[PDB]
């Protein structure tokens, strides 16, 4: 009626995404139809709709439209050719420190906007960082994203991809702040610097073991008041690998950024704003312009 | 010998001294994967 299908982009466990073109602006979009008991419209779709309707940033995906018919709906976002995962995994295209800085800058600017609006993207991973041919990174899906301000609200500890989960979520924190997004951002930066998933865990216990053996178990002066979380279990005291050994070719400023994003104390962990103010982003290699960022061709 | 103590000898005959094509992607899934009214 107003959008014509162009390509069969794919599916997620609750959506079917088709590339499409609108007959009003000949702009290429991505339409997302939601599948279908006795509950009504799926809550992930409603969460997408409600959160993305009140955000407008360069670096957050925006649903250009939303509509639907009997018992089912379709959202309409900007069409994003790739994500950061296909850029990471593609061995052909190199990621120089300027390219890494560009991806980090776009991610943290989007997340700083999202956090100033008291919304928490509780699922941040290279798969969910799309980017268009103009090389503008956008935070992809908000089907598990919430508002983190209110005390009276009991959150859930199970919601973020395990590999990009903060230690407090694995310990079962029912209440948390922007530290979950910032830990996932640190893990994204680590995967962006190594091109392989930092801390790939087989379970929550395995994820915690790998976090602790890679960074050192927190000593309660680094993460004071840790022992109070609902699913806290004591761990063997791992020394942790020095950060200038994990990332053997990262500058000192980048190392400070890594250390800030990977602080165990979810309150000492740097926020998007103060991450953006660190010397890393202001130092000599400027971020690449979105026009010069590498695109995985086919 | 010890198939001797391991009973596989039938499978010796059969299996002492094609297959796909013989007996007459997807794997990546296997790694990471009123209707009449409709059409």
């Amino acid at each position: 009626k107003r959008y014509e299908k162009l390509d069969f982009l794919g599916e997620g466990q609750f959506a079917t995404v088709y590339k499409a073109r609108d007959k009003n602006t000949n702009q290429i979009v991505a339409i997302k139809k939601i599948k279908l008991a006795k509950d009504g419209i799926n809550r992930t779709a409603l969460r997408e709709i409600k959160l993305l309707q009140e955000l407008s940033h360069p670096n957050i995906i925006g649903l250009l439209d939303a509509f639907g018919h009997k018992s089912n709906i379709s959202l309409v976002f900007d069409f994003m050719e790739t994500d950061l995962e296909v850029i990471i995994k593609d061995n052909s295209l190199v990621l120089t420190p300027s390219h890494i800085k560009a991806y980090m800058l776009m991610t943290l600017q989007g997340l700083e906007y999202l956090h100033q609006h008291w919304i928490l993207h509780r699922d941040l991973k290279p798969n969910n960082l799309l980017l268009d041919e103009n090389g503008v990174l956008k935070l992809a899906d908000f089907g598990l994203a919430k508002s983190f301000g209110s005390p009276n609200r009991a959150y859930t500890h199970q919601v973020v991809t395990r590999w990009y989960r903060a230690p407090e979520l694995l310990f079962g924190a029912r209440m948390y702040g922007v530290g979950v997004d910032m830990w996932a951002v640190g893990c994204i930066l680590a995967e962006l610097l190594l091109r392989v998933p930092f801390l790939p865990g087989d379970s929550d216990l395995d994820q915690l073991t790998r976090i602790f053996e890679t960074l050192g178990t927190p000593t309660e002066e680094q993460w004071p008041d840790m022992c109070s979380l609902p699913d806290y279990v004591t761990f063997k005291s791992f020394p942790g690998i020095p950060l200038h050994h994990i990332f053997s070719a990262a500058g000192d400023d980048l190392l400070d950024l890594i250390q800030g994003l990977f602080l165990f104390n979810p309150c000492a962990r740097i926020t998007a704003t103060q991450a953006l103010k660190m010397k890393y982003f202001s130092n000599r290699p400027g971020p690449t312009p979105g026009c010069q960022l590498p695109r995985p061709n086919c | 010998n010890l198939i001797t103590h391991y009973n596989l000898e039938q499978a010796y005959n059969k299996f002492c001294g094609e297959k796909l094509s013989n007996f007459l992607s997807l794997r990546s899934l296997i790694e990471k994967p009123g209707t009449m009214l409709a059409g």
Partner: peptide, 8 residues
């Protein structure tokens, strides 16, 4: 070991 998106 590549996992699935976490499930409500």
């Amino acid at each position: 070991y590549s996992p699935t998106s976490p499930s409500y």
